[PDB]
Amino acid sequence: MSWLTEEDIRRWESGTFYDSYRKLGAHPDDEGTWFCVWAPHADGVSVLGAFNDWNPEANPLERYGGGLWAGYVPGARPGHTYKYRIRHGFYQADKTDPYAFAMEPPTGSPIEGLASIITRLDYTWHDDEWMRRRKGPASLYEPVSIYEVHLGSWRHKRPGESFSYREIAEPLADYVQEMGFTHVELLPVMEHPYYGSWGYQVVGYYAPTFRYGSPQDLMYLIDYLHQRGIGVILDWVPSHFAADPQGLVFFDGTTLFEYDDPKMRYHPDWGTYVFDYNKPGVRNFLISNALFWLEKYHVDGLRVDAVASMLYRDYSRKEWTPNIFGGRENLEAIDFIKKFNETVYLHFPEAMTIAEESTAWPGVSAPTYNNGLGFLYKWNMGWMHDTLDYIQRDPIYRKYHHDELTFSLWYAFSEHYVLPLSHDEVVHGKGSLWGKMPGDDWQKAANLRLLFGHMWGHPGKKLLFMGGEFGQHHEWNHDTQLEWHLLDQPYHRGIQLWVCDLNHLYRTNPALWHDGPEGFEWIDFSDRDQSVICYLRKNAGRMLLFVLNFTPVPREHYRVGVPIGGPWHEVLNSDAVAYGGSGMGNFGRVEAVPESWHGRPFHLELTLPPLAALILEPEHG
């Protein structure tokens, strides 16, 4: 007889209500709006909005089972702003809607206020074909090349003003299409008061914002990218929420969304920060939100950061405590992750879930029925550290650190990996990708191409943060746009054209699509003295040879074992003049010699250009 059915209430309090945004939040009809809030310890809840005059006594919600409050408001219309007054004993606080589907332009109080917005999510999609063929499967055996994008700081329309969700669609799509990426990965779009947070704090999990436009503007952006053949992955932040006073903290006068406190007359005060993954309402709130992005915004993937902060509760010397009653591991959090992944693939097979986990937890990307966390992909952070360590060393000392370059193949196959050069690596004291490279300007440029050559040959899918693809000079600055003027310089234009030609090779040559052991075999890793390595990528009857010269010394008559005789050809050469290189290479037919090298039947005899990546293939046509 009310907003809520008895089945809604059973499902909420057992924590099996995974479409709870159907009923929680603000739901307009043709005449008024239903409001519904979880607040099991409040003594009263009222809805304050433009439609009364923010009168806490105009519309006091009634309480239902499971700690849910609900109330109808006639004449509350889409576009009205509103807030909740929560009363707990003698304390009273105004709160934004946790389930807000939009939050008003003032969306801090530094910003000029903060109210949620009554909204309908109505939108007509035109992306049926993408969603059918998006059988985005085991993309495990296909090319996946991700362009990582913070929306606001990519390009600016006139000065310090970002493009909108609608205004960014066409230039972003054009660029991603010419650069040859398959996907765009977006830093959190969920509403956040601090822009400088990059989105990772988050007060509005169900609200795409109003900073780049409305909910339907972002839908148009995703609809538009889908029709241009580009997938979209959303960074998603279940590990913690913003500490802002109007967000989820406290909420009903107690620890609701965060963990509850022990006895605290001194005693190591450990409490909160993460979500309380053992409250049924929290599992409803987060699992509902993952499905919400997948269903209401057609997104193709979710990436979870800081999975280590969820798996462990460690912090300190002395925090939970040891003995023989538990471990360092957050048991309910591991169960939440596994329920998260297995719900996503049940409801949205061939969506992608991706994890960044920084403690070498086994089986991050392994099925939950083998004690895995259930993700499709794991960020290869180990590969990133070793590669950025080695490449940063001046070439004269690289011969003493050859192991830093060949080590990642030891562990390259223990997960399904994305090889990522993310935004985290080009901020704070770390330098841009260009700035990390040693030597003179041409050597910086060649090192960045050599780095990309190796990254695309190394097993794993690919992710690069915006700006990195043309060797931007400075660290990423979220308050400005990227340094696009550098595309008038030949070394940066040349780096961009080479990433583009790498992407094209990745997408048209199956030799690079199988990232498991069968897909890679060493040709030689023993040349420490000259800092060279050779290796094969191998899939469906196709083969590419990678030869990588990590010193600015050209090598003539350099012999390389190959397993197939006959005429070979250079497919890509990072010293081509088009990329800013000097134009050395192995041109025309390269005939394989029927003598033996590297324990191989045949060998090629090549010129290795300085700081260059060579990619060759046998003639099979």
Side-chain angles (χ1 to χ4, degrees), residues 189-232:
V189 294
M190 291 125 268
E191 191 61 285
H192 41 290
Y194 184 27
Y195 192 51
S197 148
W198 310 330
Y200 282 104
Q201 303 300 61
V202 181
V203 57
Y205 281 85
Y206 290 81
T209 64
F210 258 77
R211 204 178 243 126
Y212 312 116
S214 66
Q216 281 85 356
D217 291 333
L218 164 62
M219 297 179 187
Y220 173 101
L221 166 63
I222 295 162
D223 200 3
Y224 186 96
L225 290 160
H226 278 177
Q227 297 171 251
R228 313 262 326 256
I230 301 153
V232 176

mmCIF file of all heavy atoms in Angstrom, residues 189-232:
data_model
loop_
_atom_site.group_PDB
_atom_site.id
_atom_site.type_symbol
_atom_site.label_atom_id
_atom_site.label_comp_id
_atom_site.label_asym_id
_atom_site.label_seq_id
_atom_site.Cartn_x
_atom_site.Cartn_y
_atom_site.Cartn_z
ATOM 1 N N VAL A 189 33.728 9.127 -13.039
ATOM 2 C CA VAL A 189 32.767 10.160 -13.401
ATOM 3 C C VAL A 189 31.753 10.386 -12.296
ATOM 4 O O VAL A 189 31.029 11.392 -12.324
ATOM 5 C CB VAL A 189 32.069 9.846 -14.738
ATOM 6 C CG1 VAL A 189 33.085 9.889 -15.854
ATOM 7 C CG2 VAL A 189 31.367 8.490 -14.692
ATOM 8 N N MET A 190 31.691 9.502 -11.310
ATOM 9 C CA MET A 190 30.762 9.705 -10.214
ATOM 10 C C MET A 190 31.076 11.007 -9.498
ATOM 11 O O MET A 190 32.233 11.414 -9.383
ATOM 12 C CB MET A 190 30.845 8.540 -9.249
ATOM 13 C CG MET A 190 30.311 7.273 -9.836
ATOM 14 S SD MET A 190 31.574 6.006 -9.705
ATOM 15 C CE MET A 190 32.386 6.179 -11.255
ATOM 16 N N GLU A 191 30.032 11.637 -8.985
ATOM 17 C CA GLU A 191 30.145 12.984 -8.459
ATOM 18 C C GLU A 191 31.124 13.063 -7.286
ATOM 19 O O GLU A 191 31.115 12.218 -6.381
ATOM 20 C CB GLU A 191 28.768 13.488 -8.046
ATOM 21 C CG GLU A 191 28.743 14.948 -7.731
ATOM 22 C CD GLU A 191 29.123 15.793 -8.913
ATOM 23 O OE1 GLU A 191 30.327 15.839 -9.245
ATOM 24 O OE2 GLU A 191 28.207 16.393 -9.514
ATOM 25 N N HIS A 192 31.971 14.105 -7.308
ATOM 26 C CA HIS A 192 33.031 14.342 -6.291
ATOM 27 C C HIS A 192 33.131 15.839 -6.045
ATOM 28 O O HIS A 192 33.273 16.613 -7.012
ATOM 29 C CB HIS A 192 34.401 13.799 -6.718
ATOM 30 C CG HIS A 192 34.720 14.032 -8.166
ATOM 31 N ND1 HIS A 192 34.068 13.376 -9.192
ATOM 32 C CD2 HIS A 192 35.620 14.850 -8.763
ATOM 33 C CE1 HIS A 192 34.556 13.776 -10.353
ATOM 34 N NE2 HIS A 192 35.494 14.673 -10.122
ATOM 35 N N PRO A 193 33.108 16.278 -4.783
ATOM 36 C CA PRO A 193 33.273 17.724 -4.501
ATOM 37 C C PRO A 193 34.628 18.305 -4.914
ATOM 38 O O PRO A 193 34.675 19.431 -5.419
ATOM 39 C CB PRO A 193 33.061 17.803 -2.980
ATOM 40 C CG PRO A 193 33.455 16.448 -2.470
ATOM 41 C CD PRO A 193 33.029 15.469 -3.554
ATOM 42 N N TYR A 194 35.732 17.597 -4.715
ATOM 43 C CA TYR A 194 37.057 18.143 -5.011
ATOM 44 C C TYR A 194 37.497 17.692 -6.403
ATOM 45 O O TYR A 194 37.829 16.523 -6.607
ATOM 46 C CB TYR A 194 38.081 17.731 -3.950
ATOM 47 C CG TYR A 194 39.448 18.369 -4.172
ATOM 48 C CD1 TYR A 194 39.563 19.594 -4.843
ATOM 49 C CD2 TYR A 194 40.628 17.753 -3.723
ATOM 50 C CE1 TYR A 194 40.803 20.190 -5.063
ATOM 51 C CE2 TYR A 194 41.889 18.352 -3.941
ATOM 52 C CZ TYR A 194 41.962 19.573 -4.612
ATOM 53 O OH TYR A 194 43.183 20.186 -4.846
ATOM 54 N N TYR A 195 37.518 18.631 -7.352
ATOM 55 C CA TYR A 195 38.063 18.346 -8.674
ATOM 56 C C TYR A 195 39.469 17.760 -8.586
ATOM 57 O O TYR A 195 39.779 16.776 -9.265
ATOM 58 C CB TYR A 195 38.055 19.624 -9.516
ATOM 59 C CG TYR A 195 38.328 19.452 -10.999
ATOM 60 C CD1 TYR A 195 37.627 18.529 -11.769
ATOM 61 C CD2 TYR A 195 39.274 20.241 -11.635
ATOM 62 C CE1 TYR A 195 37.878 18.394 -13.137
ATOM 63 C CE2 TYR A 195 39.535 20.113 -12.989
ATOM 64 C CZ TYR A 195 38.843 19.191 -13.736
ATOM 65 O OH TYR A 195 39.125 19.090 -15.082
ATOM 66 N N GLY A 196 40.330 18.332 -7.733
ATOM 67 C CA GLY A 196 41.704 17.858 -7.550
ATOM 68 C C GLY A 196 41.822 16.449 -6.999
ATOM 69 O O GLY A 196 42.919 15.883 -7.003
ATOM 70 N N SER A 197 40.725 15.875 -6.514
ATOM 71 C CA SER A 197 40.669 14.454 -6.191
ATOM 72 C C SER A 197 40.775 13.556 -7.417
ATOM 73 O O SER A 197 41.062 12.363 -7.266
ATOM 74 C CB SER A 197 39.367 14.177 -5.452
ATOM 75 O OG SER A 197 38.869 12.888 -5.723
ATOM 76 N N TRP A 198 40.568 14.108 -8.620
ATOM 77 C CA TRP A 198 40.511 13.406 -9.900
ATOM 78 C C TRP A 198 39.287 12.516 -9.990
ATOM 79 O O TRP A 198 39.173 11.719 -10.922
ATOM 80 C CB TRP A 198 41.761 12.564 -10.184
ATOM 81 C CG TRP A 198 43.083 13.280 -10.009
ATOM 82 C CD1 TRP A 198 43.330 14.613 -10.186
ATOM 83 C CD2 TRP A 198 44.330 12.687 -9.622
ATOM 84 N NE1 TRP A 198 44.646 14.879 -9.933
ATOM 85 C CE2 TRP A 198 45.286 13.719 -9.585
ATOM 86 C CE3 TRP A 198 44.730 11.385 -9.312
ATOM 87 C CZ2 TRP A 198 46.628 13.489 -9.246
ATOM 88 C CZ3 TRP A 198 46.064 11.154 -8.973
ATOM 89 C CH2 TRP A 198 46.994 12.205 -8.937
ATOM 90 N N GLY A 199 38.365 12.638 -9.052
ATOM 91 C CA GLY A 199 37.186 11.818 -9.021
ATOM 92 C C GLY A 199 37.249 10.688 -8.028
ATOM 93 O O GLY A 199 36.241 10.006 -7.840
ATOM 94 N N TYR A 200 38.388 10.466 -7.378
ATOM 95 C CA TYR A 200 38.547 9.260 -6.579
ATOM 96 C C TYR A 200 37.994 9.375 -5.162
ATOM 97 O O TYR A 200 38.085 8.401 -4.407
ATOM 98 C CB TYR A 200 40.024 8.840 -6.540
ATOM 99 C CG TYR A 200 40.453 8.151 -7.815
ATOM 100 C CD1 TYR A 200 41.222 8.822 -8.761
ATOM 101 C CD2 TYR A 200 40.074 6.829 -8.086
ATOM 102 C CE1 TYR A 200 41.606 8.217 -9.934
ATOM 103 C CE2 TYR A 200 40.451 6.209 -9.278
ATOM 104 C CZ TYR A 200 41.219 6.919 -10.191
ATOM 105 O OH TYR A 200 41.611 6.348 -11.368
ATOM 106 N N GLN A 201 37.415 10.508 -4.765
ATOM 107 C CA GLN A 201 36.812 10.534 -3.431
ATOM 108 C C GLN A 201 35.381 9.994 -3.478
ATOM 109 O O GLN A 201 35.101 8.886 -2.995
ATOM 110 C CB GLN A 201 36.874 11.942 -2.833
ATOM 111 C CG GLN A 201 38.254 12.519 -2.751
ATOM 112 C CD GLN A 201 39.213 11.718 -1.896
ATOM 113 O OE1 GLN A 201 39.492 10.550 -2.177
ATOM 114 N NE2 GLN A 201 39.779 12.366 -0.877
ATOM 115 N N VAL A 202 34.479 10.763 -4.082
ATOM 116 C CA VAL A 202 33.148 10.304 -4.506
ATOM 117 C C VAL A 202 32.141 10.465 -3.380
ATOM 118 O O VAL A 202 32.176 9.749 -2.368
ATOM 119 C CB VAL A 202 33.113 8.854 -5.038
ATOM 120 C CG1 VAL A 202 31.676 8.494 -5.478
ATOM 121 C CG2 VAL A 202 34.100 8.639 -6.190
ATOM 122 N N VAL A 203 31.230 11.410 -3.593
ATOM 123 C CA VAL A 203 30.050 11.580 -2.765
ATOM 124 C C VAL A 203 28.781 11.067 -3.457
ATOM 125 O O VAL A 203 27.821 10.694 -2.764
ATOM 126 C CB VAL A 203 29.917 13.070 -2.363
ATOM 127 C CG1 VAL A 203 29.857 13.941 -3.582
ATOM 128 C CG2 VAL A 203 28.704 13.319 -1.484
ATOM 129 N N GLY A 204 28.753 11.009 -4.789
ATOM 130 C CA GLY A 204 27.556 10.564 -5.493
ATOM 131 C C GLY A 204 27.757 9.392 -6.436
ATOM 132 O O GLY A 204 28.005 9.584 -7.633
ATOM 133 N N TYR A 205 27.632 8.169 -5.907
ATOM 134 C CA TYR A 205 27.938 6.981 -6.701
ATOM 135 C C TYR A 205 26.956 6.768 -7.855
ATOM 136 O O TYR A 205 27.333 6.167 -8.865
ATOM 137 C CB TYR A 205 27.991 5.737 -5.799
ATOM 138 C CG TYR A 205 29.302 5.630 -5.054
ATOM 139 C CD1 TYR A 205 29.507 6.302 -3.850
ATOM 140 C CD2 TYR A 205 30.353 4.898 -5.577
ATOM 141 C CE1 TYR A 205 30.709 6.214 -3.184
ATOM 142 C CE2 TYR A 205 31.557 4.809 -4.922
ATOM 143 C CZ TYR A 205 31.735 5.473 -3.728
ATOM 144 O OH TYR A 205 32.951 5.381 -3.095
ATOM 145 N N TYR A 206 25.712 7.241 -7.740
ATOM 146 C CA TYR A 206 24.721 7.057 -8.799
ATOM 147 C C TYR A 206 24.578 8.288 -9.683
ATOM 148 O O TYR A 206 23.658 8.353 -10.503
ATOM 149 C CB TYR A 206 23.355 6.674 -8.205
ATOM 150 C CG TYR A 206 23.338 5.283 -7.616
ATOM 151 C CD1 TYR A 206 23.834 5.044 -6.336
ATOM 152 C CD2 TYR A 206 22.860 4.203 -8.346
ATOM 153 C CE1 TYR A 206 23.841 3.778 -5.796
ATOM 154 C CE2 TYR A 206 22.875 2.930 -7.823
ATOM 155 C CZ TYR A 206 23.360 2.717 -6.544
ATOM 156 O OH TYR A 206 23.358 1.432 -6.008
ATOM 157 N N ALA A 207 25.468 9.259 -9.541
ATOM 158 C CA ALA A 207 25.308 10.564 -10.180
ATOM 159 C C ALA A 207 26.526 10.848 -11.036
ATOM 160 O O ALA A 207 27.623 11.049 -10.493
ATOM 161 C CB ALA A 207 25.115 11.656 -9.127
ATOM 162 N N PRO A 208 26.403 10.865 -12.365
ATOM 163 C CA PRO A 208 27.578 11.132 -13.217
ATOM 164 C C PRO A 208 28.143 12.524 -13.070
ATOM 165 O O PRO A 208 29.242 12.763 -13.584
ATOM 166 C CB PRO A 208 27.045 10.920 -14.636
ATOM 167 C CG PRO A 208 25.530 11.123 -14.515
ATOM 168 C CD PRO A 208 25.158 10.685 -13.134
ATOM 169 N N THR A 209 27.420 13.438 -12.429
ATOM 170 C CA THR A 209 27.807 14.823 -12.116
ATOM 171 C C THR A 209 26.815 15.788 -12.716
ATOM 172 O O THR A 209 25.704 15.413 -13.145
ATOM 173 C CB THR A 209 29.129 15.385 -12.684
ATOM 174 O OG1 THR A 209 29.052 15.416 -14.118
ATOM 175 C CG2 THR A 209 30.462 14.772 -12.111
ATOM 176 N N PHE A 210 27.308 17.049 -12.790
ATOM 177 C CA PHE A 210 26.822 18.055 -13.724
ATOM 178 C C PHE A 210 27.998 18.903 -14.224
ATOM 179 O O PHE A 210 27.786 19.917 -14.894
ATOM 180 C CB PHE A 210 25.678 18.892 -13.080
ATOM 181 C CG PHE A 210 24.274 18.496 -13.559
ATOM 182 C CD1 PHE A 210 23.646 17.348 -13.079
ATOM 183 C CD2 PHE A 210 23.590 19.277 -14.498
ATOM 184 C CE1 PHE A 210 22.348 16.970 -13.544
ATOM 185 C CE2 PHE A 210 22.289 18.910 -14.959
ATOM 186 C CZ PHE A 210 21.672 17.752 -14.476
ATOM 187 N N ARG A 211 29.233 18.460 -13.972
ATOM 188 C CA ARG A 211 30.446 19.203 -14.322
ATOM 189 C C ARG A 211 30.716 19.198 -15.828
ATOM 190 O O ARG A 211 31.213 20.187 -16.379
ATOM 191 C CB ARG A 211 31.621 18.595 -13.567
ATOM 192 C CG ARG A 211 32.803 19.465 -13.316
ATOM 193 C CD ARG A 211 33.823 18.671 -12.512
ATOM 194 N NE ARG A 211 34.086 19.241 -11.191
ATOM 195 C CZ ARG A 211 33.983 18.574 -10.042
ATOM 196 N NH1 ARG A 211 33.604 17.298 -10.032
ATOM 197 N NH2 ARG A 211 34.242 19.173 -8.889
ATOM 198 N N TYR A 212 30.414 18.093 -16.504
ATOM 199 C CA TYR A 212 30.512 18.007 -17.954
ATOM 200 C C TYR A 212 29.144 17.943 -18.639
ATOM 201 O O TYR A 212 29.082 17.742 -19.860
ATOM 202 C CB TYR A 212 31.354 16.792 -18.343
ATOM 203 C CG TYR A 212 32.648 16.700 -17.577
ATOM 204 C CD1 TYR A 212 32.893 15.641 -16.715
ATOM 205 C CD2 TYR A 212 33.628 17.686 -17.709
ATOM 206 C CE1 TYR A 212 34.081 15.560 -16.013
ATOM 207 C CE2 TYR A 212 34.814 17.617 -17.003
ATOM 208 C CZ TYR A 212 35.039 16.548 -16.159
ATOM 209 O OH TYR A 212 36.215 16.451 -15.452
ATOM 210 N N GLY A 213 28.050 18.091 -17.886
ATOM 211 C CA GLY A 213 26.711 17.988 -18.421
ATOM 212 C C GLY A 213 25.824 17.127 -17.534
ATOM 213 O O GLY A 213 26.148 16.835 -16.386
ATOM 214 N N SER A 214 24.700 16.712 -18.102
ATOM 215 C CA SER A 214 23.657 15.977 -17.397
ATOM 216 C C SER A 214 23.850 14.474 -17.569
ATOM 217 O O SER A 214 24.644 14.022 -18.399
ATOM 218 C CB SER A 214 22.297 16.398 -17.941
ATOM 219 O OG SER A 214 22.182 15.976 -19.292
ATOM 220 N N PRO A 215 23.113 13.651 -16.800
ATOM 221 C CA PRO A 215 23.139 12.192 -17.053
ATOM 222 C C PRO A 215 22.945 11.807 -18.507
ATOM 223 O O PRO A 215 23.648 10.922 -19.003
ATOM 224 C CB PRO A 215 21.989 11.677 -16.187
ATOM 225 C CG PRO A 215 21.950 12.621 -15.037
ATOM 226 C CD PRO A 215 22.370 13.979 -15.568
ATOM 227 N N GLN A 216 22.007 12.450 -19.204
ATOM 228 C CA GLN A 216 21.775 12.146 -20.611
ATOM 229 C C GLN A 216 22.897 12.657 -21.511
ATOM 230 O O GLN A 216 23.040 12.166 -22.635
ATOM 231 C CB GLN A 216 20.431 12.736 -21.060
ATOM 232 C CG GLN A 216 19.216 11.932 -20.643
ATOM 233 C CD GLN A 216 18.755 12.278 -19.236
ATOM 234 O OE1 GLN A 216 19.396 13.068 -18.534
ATOM 235 N NE2 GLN A 216 17.652 11.682 -18.813
ATOM 236 N N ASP A 217 23.688 13.638 -21.063
ATOM 237 C CA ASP A 217 24.830 14.057 -21.875
ATOM 238 C C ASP A 217 25.906 12.987 -21.896
ATOM 239 O O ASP A 217 26.513 12.723 -22.939
ATOM 240 C CB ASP A 217 25.412 15.367 -21.357
ATOM 241 C CG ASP A 217 24.491 16.544 -21.578
ATOM 242 O OD1 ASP A 217 23.685 16.497 -22.529
ATOM 243 O OD2 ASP A 217 24.584 17.519 -20.798
ATOM 244 N N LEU A 218 26.162 12.366 -20.752
ATOM 245 C CA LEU A 218 27.123 11.272 -20.704
ATOM 246 C C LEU A 218 26.606 10.041 -21.461
ATOM 247 O O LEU A 218 27.374 9.358 -22.155
ATOM 248 C CB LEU A 218 27.427 10.959 -19.243
ATOM 249 C CG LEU A 218 28.097 9.629 -18.958
ATOM 250 C CD1 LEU A 218 29.441 9.596 -19.627
ATOM 251 C CD2 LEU A 218 28.221 9.439 -17.465
ATOM 252 N N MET A 219 25.309 9.740 -21.341
ATOM 253 C CA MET A 219 24.721 8.686 -22.163
ATOM 254 C C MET A 219 24.936 8.948 -23.654
ATOM 255 O O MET A 219 25.271 8.025 -24.414
ATOM 256 C CB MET A 219 23.228 8.553 -21.860
ATOM 257 C CG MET A 219 22.912 8.123 -20.423
ATOM 258 S SD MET A 219 21.129 8.004 -20.117
ATOM 259 C CE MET A 219 21.093 7.705 -18.345
ATOM 260 N N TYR A 220 24.730 10.191 -24.098
ATOM 261 C CA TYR A 220 24.993 10.521 -25.494
ATOM 262 C C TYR A 220 26.455 10.262 -25.849
ATOM 263 O O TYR A 220 26.758 9.774 -26.946
ATOM 264 C CB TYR A 220 24.613 11.985 -25.765
ATOM 265 C CG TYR A 220 24.999 12.485 -27.148
ATOM 266 C CD1 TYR A 220 24.061 12.587 -28.163
ATOM 267 C CD2 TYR A 220 26.316 12.867 -27.433
ATOM 268 C CE1 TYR A 220 24.426 13.034 -29.438
ATOM 269 C CE2 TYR A 220 26.691 13.312 -28.691
ATOM 270 C CZ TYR A 220 25.749 13.398 -29.690
ATOM 271 O OH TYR A 220 26.151 13.845 -30.933
ATOM 272 N N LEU A 221 27.377 10.602 -24.933
ATOM 273 C CA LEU A 221 28.801 10.373 -25.172
ATOM 274 C C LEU A 221 29.093 8.891 -25.352
ATOM 275 O O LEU A 221 29.812 8.493 -26.278
ATOM 276 C CB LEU A 221 29.633 10.952 -24.020
ATOM 277 C CG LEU A 221 31.115 10.527 -23.935
ATOM 278 C CD1 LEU A 221 31.899 10.989 -25.163
ATOM 279 C CD2 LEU A 221 31.772 11.035 -22.662
ATOM 280 N N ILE A 222 28.537 8.057 -24.473
ATOM 281 C CA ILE A 222 28.752 6.613 -24.566
ATOM 282 C C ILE A 222 28.045 6.026 -25.795
ATOM 283 O O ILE A 222 28.623 5.218 -26.528
ATOM 284 C CB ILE A 222 28.299 5.932 -23.259
ATOM 285 C CG1 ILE A 222 29.189 6.404 -22.101
ATOM 286 C CG2 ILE A 222 28.299 4.406 -23.413
ATOM 287 C CD1 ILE A 222 28.608 6.177 -20.714
ATOM 288 N N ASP A 223 26.787 6.415 -26.029
ATOM 289 C CA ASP A 223 26.077 6.064 -27.263
ATOM 290 C C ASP A 223 26.891 6.402 -28.507
ATOM 291 O O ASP A 223 26.971 5.606 -29.448
ATOM 292 C CB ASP A 223 24.740 6.813 -27.297
ATOM 293 C CG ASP A 223 23.728 6.193 -28.242
ATOM 294 O OD1 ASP A 223 24.028 5.138 -28.848
ATOM 295 O OD2 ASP A 223 22.625 6.773 -28.365
ATOM 296 N N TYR A 224 27.494 7.593 -28.528
ATOM 297 C CA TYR A 224 28.222 8.060 -29.702
ATOM 298 C C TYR A 224 29.513 7.270 -29.903
ATOM 299 O O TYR A 224 29.858 6.913 -31.033
ATOM 300 C CB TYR A 224 28.502 9.564 -29.555
ATOM 301 C CG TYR A 224 29.139 10.218 -30.767
ATOM 302 C CD1 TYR A 224 28.372 10.880 -31.714
ATOM 303 C CD2 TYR A 224 30.520 10.191 -30.950
ATOM 304 C CE1 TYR A 224 28.966 11.485 -32.830
ATOM 305 C CE2 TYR A 224 31.114 10.794 -32.049
ATOM 306 C CZ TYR A 224 30.337 11.431 -32.986
ATOM 307 O OH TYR A 224 30.946 12.022 -34.067
ATOM 308 N N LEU A 225 30.245 7.002 -28.822
ATOM 309 C CA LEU A 225 31.480 6.240 -28.945
ATOM 310 C C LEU A 225 31.191 4.816 -29.394
ATOM 311 O O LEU A 225 31.937 4.246 -30.199
ATOM 312 C CB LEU A 225 32.230 6.253 -27.611
ATOM 313 C CG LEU A 225 32.843 7.589 -27.180
ATOM 314 C CD1 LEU A 225 33.125 7.609 -25.680
ATOM 315 C CD2 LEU A 225 34.116 7.876 -27.952
ATOM 316 N N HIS A 226 30.098 4.235 -28.887
ATOM 317 C CA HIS A 226 29.708 2.875 -29.259
ATOM 318 C C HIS A 226 29.439 2.756 -30.752
ATOM 319 O O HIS A 226 29.880 1.796 -31.392
ATOM 320 C CB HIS A 226 28.488 2.452 -28.446
ATOM 321 C CG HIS A 226 28.834 1.969 -27.074
ATOM 322 N ND1 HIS A 226 27.882 1.600 -26.146
ATOM 323 C CD2 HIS A 226 30.040 1.801 -26.470
ATOM 324 C CE1 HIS A 226 28.488 1.214 -25.033
ATOM 325 N NE2 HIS A 226 29.797 1.332 -25.204
ATOM 326 N N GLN A 227 28.752 3.745 -31.335
ATOM 327 C CA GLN A 227 28.490 3.724 -32.768
ATOM 328 C C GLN A 227 29.737 3.986 -33.598
ATOM 329 O O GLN A 227 29.767 3.639 -34.780
ATOM 330 C CB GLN A 227 27.418 4.747 -33.122
ATOM 331 C CG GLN A 227 26.088 4.456 -32.488
ATOM 332 C CD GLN A 227 25.117 5.589 -32.690
ATOM 333 O OE1 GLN A 227 24.787 6.320 -31.749
ATOM 334 N NE2 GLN A 227 24.644 5.744 -33.925
ATOM 335 N N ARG A 228 30.761 4.594 -33.025
ATOM 336 C CA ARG A 228 32.019 4.741 -33.734
ATOM 337 C C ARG A 228 32.994 3.609 -33.434
ATOM 338 O O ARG A 228 34.176 3.726 -33.767
ATOM 339 C CB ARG A 228 32.649 6.097 -33.405
ATOM 340 C CG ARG A 228 31.668 7.270 -33.497
ATOM 341 C CD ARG A 228 31.757 8.026 -34.815
ATOM 342 N NE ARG A 228 33.115 8.069 -35.360
ATOM 343 C CZ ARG A 228 33.921 9.132 -35.325
ATOM 344 N NH1 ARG A 228 33.537 10.277 -34.771
ATOM 345 N NH2 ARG A 228 35.124 9.054 -35.860
ATOM 346 N N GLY A 229 32.528 2.521 -32.818
ATOM 347 C CA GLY A 229 33.353 1.346 -32.622
ATOM 348 C C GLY A 229 34.309 1.395 -31.452
ATOM 349 O O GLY A 229 35.266 0.617 -31.424
ATOM 350 N N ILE A 230 34.062 2.260 -30.470
ATOM 351 C CA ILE A 230 34.945 2.482 -29.336
ATOM 352 C C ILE A 230 34.221 2.057 -28.062
ATOM 353 O O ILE A 230 33.077 2.466 -27.829
ATOM 354 C CB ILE A 230 35.373 3.962 -29.263
ATOM 355 C CG1 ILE A 230 36.096 4.360 -30.554
ATOM 356 C CG2 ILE A 230 36.278 4.209 -28.057
ATOM 357 C CD1 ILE A 230 36.002 5.819 -30.905
ATOM 358 N N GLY A 231 34.890 1.230 -27.230
ATOM 359 C CA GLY A 231 34.346 0.858 -25.937
ATOM 360 C C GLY A 231 34.675 1.866 -24.831
ATOM 361 O O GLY A 231 35.577 2.695 -24.966
ATOM 362 N N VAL A 232 33.931 1.792 -23.722
ATOM 363 C CA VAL A 232 34.098 2.710 -22.594
ATOM 364 C C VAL A 232 34.244 1.908 -21.302
ATOM 365 O O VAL A 232 33.411 1.042 -21.009
ATOM 366 C CB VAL A 232 32.919 3.700 -22.480
ATOM 367 C CG1 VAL A 232 33.073 4.571 -21.248
ATOM 368 C CG2 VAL A 232 32.797 4.553 -23.735
#
